[PDB]
RNA sequence: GGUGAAAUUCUUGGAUUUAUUGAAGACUAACUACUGCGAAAGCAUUUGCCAAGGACGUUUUCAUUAAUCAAGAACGAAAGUUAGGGGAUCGAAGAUGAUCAGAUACCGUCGUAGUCUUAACCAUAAACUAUGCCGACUAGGGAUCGGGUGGUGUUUUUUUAAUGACCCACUCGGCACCUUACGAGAAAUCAAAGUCUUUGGGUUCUGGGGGGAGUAUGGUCGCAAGGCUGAAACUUAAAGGAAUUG
């Protein structure tokens, strides 16, 4: 039967959405169906921050961040514990944790 | 068996039958 | 032959598949105010003194 | 009435030379024997004299064109980019 | 990995840093600082004449370190070497650009990104391709959560951005353009012209790239480095 | 007071490259990879290999005369992963602790404006 | 289809070239009958890397 | 270099990597959303040109010109076909390196056709919302897109106008969404799948247990691949749908 009212994607009024590639396996997946996350992270991984702050030529340094928009297919998103299988009731939960 | 490959197999069969009938015709 | 003594101040938890490895956070005895995270094989408490054969390393997990 | 179904002008070739070659010469012979609009006198009087020579019966002008059409697409786009570069050389 | 080389050579010793010399690189006069580092080439032998090998070098340096302050920390300046006179070789402007972290922090969603670019020639015969970026912003008191533009506002904004860029670069030389780009007056002129179209935050001018330089004109280059 | 090179850490998977160049980037100093210090393709990309590479490039640039570095961290990019490998922060922290001076960390991973095509096919890398 | 007095390819109880039809550039007149100084031969698949 | 691990492969002729350029073709990232347009397939750089279209507004005009439609006609992803161009990537086939008992599969490295374009064809798809179109009525709730109306509302200009961007209230037309079940349904679920034994608003198409079988044959279209139309013999008591506990 029909599992999801949205068919597992976000396509109401298009007919076609150009696909992207999974960042883990290069599977072609429509852009609306993917499991888009946003990895915003400091570059120093929070353990060398003191060493770089004391080894910097400048005080007051910003220590910038790296930003990536990660696109996952369903299989890789499930296998990498990004999303997991939810109950039939809490499948409808739309809000992020 | 899967319906797509059943369709492919009977299409190859139809092609082979076409050629063995065109042998006489 | 340099080795670095480090006093464990906080035990985190067991690691590895079979639980025979413990994450610890050690504070260096000399050159204090320096903290690092290591893996320990045997039974460890806090306030123990480890002898790191090399200090320039930090572990994450053991799958 | 319609005498032939699909061979058209290539009915003069009969059964010879193959259908896939007769199709190409059909598509090209229609073009080289068609009449075209004269860009000077405005009439449908341009006819091919020889390969590349297209002359108007009314105004007696003679244009150099394609071998089977009065103007090829390559010549059209070359005229367009030449016009654009001429418009660009002042600006 | 250290021993897996099956053959080192298809067929079958001196340190090269004793062979090299240092060289101090100078920025043009449109900067409060000049000494932006040092560079290395081999010794100027009779067959190489190391000045020519060192001529075509492009060195990137941050505008914060060029201007002392830290508010220019997200802008980079490429300086192309053009002349060498005795160990304190002088450079010239080759292109501005932002950093990836700044651009990535600027671009967020539920707002509209507006880019424009012009390919315009300046007074002293340089051909510069200037890029400008802008972002829609929520007004104060706005309760709807995206604040997108309506794609004709975008076209008008891009038109006025392009004509302002051409007007500000024409009649200006290259050094005049750098002394315009440093204090960021183009951004305030753009927001002054576009405030009657959209609120329109983040009016940064992105990279500018040289496409065609005129001939060298060492007098005009030495007019900077005094 | 400080003399600067640039660091140019390309920390991919399967390897990590650390090599200091001049501010112009034309003169190369101390190219050491992760696989030049270990005996396995596995630990070519290990954080230990990265810090050893950072250690001996630090020694070489210190005996050359370079005191500080401008750091350019780089993933594979293009159509590929665009995320930094495991050896990036290791090499960075190692050449920070070695005694070099740091300034102006930035990322130079090549990101495409609508790249050609990722490898693997539309069904992906099936394993 | 000629006789061996007329062409290098002539003769034989079957119509066949015999030796390779690719001829050296340093060949002489009377020998250059075939593909002169062919860098490659056969059907041209893919782009020629022009 | 690659992988779970490797190997094939490239490397003192300098590989990998760094910098400066240059060429080629492809693509249009991030912005990008339970957002928009389009009859559908589909469509994401800028600018210019060409014609088109919906909604809204209207105290403009015609006057029933309309709805659905056998036949018939236009368009119709990808793949494929013909002939030129282009041919950077990726890559059916193929070749190799692994794995495996085997592995002409999955993984790795090359790599042809193709992938792009022009002129023609082909007429299919899980071409899906698996839900025909037109029309009326029937529960609440808020949000959003486009247009419009009003508000001494906020901000900007030239403090101040008009704009524009917001805010509030309303309205028309959309893509949808949330909650309930008066109702419906075999249930899953549905504001349509409701107003259907209290069975009739108009109309088109399709199905009659499962296989055999979308097969054979005969037509017709197509260069071909194939498409459309389309049985029977024989065989069988079950196949099948939605949910329940294991
Ligand atoms: Mg299921
Ligand atoms: Mg579709
Ligand atoms: Mg004879
Ligand atoms: Mg002879
Ligand atoms: Mg012979
Ligand atoms: Mg004979
Ligand atoms: Mg090299
Ligand atoms: Mg884009
Ligand atoms: Mg839109
Ligand atoms: Mg194969
Ligand atoms: Mg069908
Ligand atoms: Mg259907
Ligand atoms: Mg209705
Ligand atoms: Mg409205
Ligand atoms: Mg509405
Ligand atoms: Mg809509
Ligand atoms: Mg029945
Ligand atoms: Mg039946
Ligand atoms: Mg079931
Ligand atoms: Zn005429």
UniProtKB/Swiss-Prot annotation, chain A:
* Signal sequence annotation: none
Single biological process term from Gene Ontology = maturation of LSU-rRNA from tricistronic rRNA transcript (SSU-rRNA, 5.8S rRNA, LSU-rRNA)
> Keywords for this entry?
Cytoplasm, Ribonucleoprotein, Ribosomal protein
A single MF term (Gene Ontology): structural constituent of ribosome
Q: What else is known?
A: Present with 503000 molecules/cell in log phase SD medium.
Hey, which family's this protein in? Answer: Belongs to the eukaryotic ribosomal protein eS26 family.
Role this protein plays: Component of the ribosome, a large ribonucleoprotein complex responsible for the synthesis of proteins in the cell. The small ribosomal subunit (SSU) binds messenger RNAs (mRNAs) and translates the encoded message by selecting cognate aminoacyl-transfer RNA (tRNA) molecules. The large subunit (LSU) contains the ribosomal catalytic site termed the peptidyl transferase center (PTC), which catalyzes the formation of peptide bonds, thereby polymerizing the amino acids delivered by tRNAs into a polypeptide chain.
Q: What is this protein called?
A: Small ribosomal subunit protein eS26B
- Organism listed in the record: Saccharomyces cerevisiae (strain ATCC 204508 / S288c) (Baker's yeast)
From Swiss-Prot, chain B:
Tell me the GO BP annotations in alphabetical order.
cytoplasmic translation
State the residue spans of region: Disordered. Answer: 1-25
Q: Which GO terms describe its molecular function?
A: structural constituent of ribosome
One Gene Ontology cellular component: cytosolic large ribosomal subunit
The answer on whether this UniProt entry bears the keyword DNA-binding reads no
- Return the InterPro entries for the record: Ribosomal_eS32 (IPR007836)
Which locations, inside or outside the cell, does it occupy? Cytoplasm
**Source superkingdom:** Eukaryota
Note whether Cytoplasm occurs among the keywords: yes
Where is it mostly found? cytoplasm
Keyword tags: Cytoplasm, Ribonucleoprotein, Ribosomal protein
Q: What does the UniProt record say this protein does?
A: Component of the ribosome, a large ribonucleoprotein complex responsible for the synthesis of proteins in the cell. The small ribosomal subunit (SSU) binds messenger RNAs (mRNAs) and translates the encoded message by selecting cognate aminoacyl-transfer RNA (tRNA) molecules. The large subunit (LSU) contains the ribosomal catalytic site termed the peptidyl transferase center (PTC), which catalyzes the formation of peptide bonds, thereby polymerizing the amino acids delivered by tRNAs into a polypeptide chain.
State the oligomer form and interacting partners: Component of the small ribosomal subunit (SSU). Mature yeast ribosomes consist of a small (40S) and a large (60S) subunit. The 40S small subunit contains 1 molecule of ribosomal RNA (18S rRNA) and 33 different proteins (encoded by 57 genes). The large 60S subunit contains 3 rRNA molecules (25S, 5.8S and 5S rRNA) and 46 different proteins (encoded by 81 genes).
- In which family does this protein belong, per the annotation? Belongs to the eukaryotic ribosomal protein eS32 family.
What does the miscellaneous comment read? Present with 4910 molecules/cell in log phase SD medium. There are 2 genes for this protein in yeast.
UniProtKB/Swiss-Prot annotation, chain F:
Q: Which GO terms describe its molecular function?
A: RNA binding; small ribosomal subunit rRNA binding; structural constituent of ribosome
Region of interest (Disordered), residue spans: 107-127
Q: Which SUPFAM superfamilies match?
A: Translational machinery components
Source organism, top-level taxon: Eukaryota
NCBIfam families under this entry?
PRK09607.1
Q: What task does this protein carry out?
A: Component of the ribosome, a large ribonucleoprotein complex responsible for the synthesis of proteins in the cell. The small ribosomal subunit (SSU) binds messenger RNAs (mRNAs) and translates the encoded message by selecting cognate aminoacyl-transfer RNA (tRNA) molecules. The large subunit (LSU) contains the ribosomal catalytic site termed the peptidyl transferase center (PTC), which catalyzes the formation of peptide bonds, thereby polymerizing the amino acids delivered by tRNAs into a polypeptide chain.
Q: What is this protein called?
A: Small ribosomal subunit protein uS11B
Curated annotation (Swiss-Prot), chain G:
Where can this protein be found? Cytoplasm
Domain of life the protein comes from: Eukaryota
The modified positions for Phosphoserine read 47
Role of this protein: Component of the ribosome, a large ribonucleoprotein complex responsible for the synthesis of proteins in the cell. The small ribosomal subunit (SSU) binds messenger RNAs (mRNAs) and translates the encoded message by selecting cognate aminoacyl-transfer RNA (tRNA) molecules. The large subunit (LSU) contains the ribosomal catalytic site termed the peptidyl transferase center (PTC), which catalyzes the formation of peptide bonds, thereby polymerizing the amino acids delivered by tRNAs into a polypeptide chain.
Describe, as the record does, how this protein assembles with itself and its partners.
Answer: Component of the large ribosomal subunit (LSU). Mature yeast ribosomes consist of a small (40S) and a large (60S) subunit. The 40S small subunit contains 1 molecule of ribosomal RNA (18S rRNA) and 33 different proteins (encoded by 57 genes). The large 60S subunit contains 3 rRNA molecules (25S, 5.8S and 5S rRNA) and 46 different proteins (encoded by 81 genes).
| Family statement | Belongs to the universal ribosomal protein uL2 family.
Q: Look up the further comments and give them.
A: There are 2 genes for uL2 in yeast.
Q: What is this protein identified as?
A: Large ribosomal subunit protein uL2A
Q: Which gene encodes it?
A: RPL2A
Full-protein residues shown here are 203 to 252 of 254
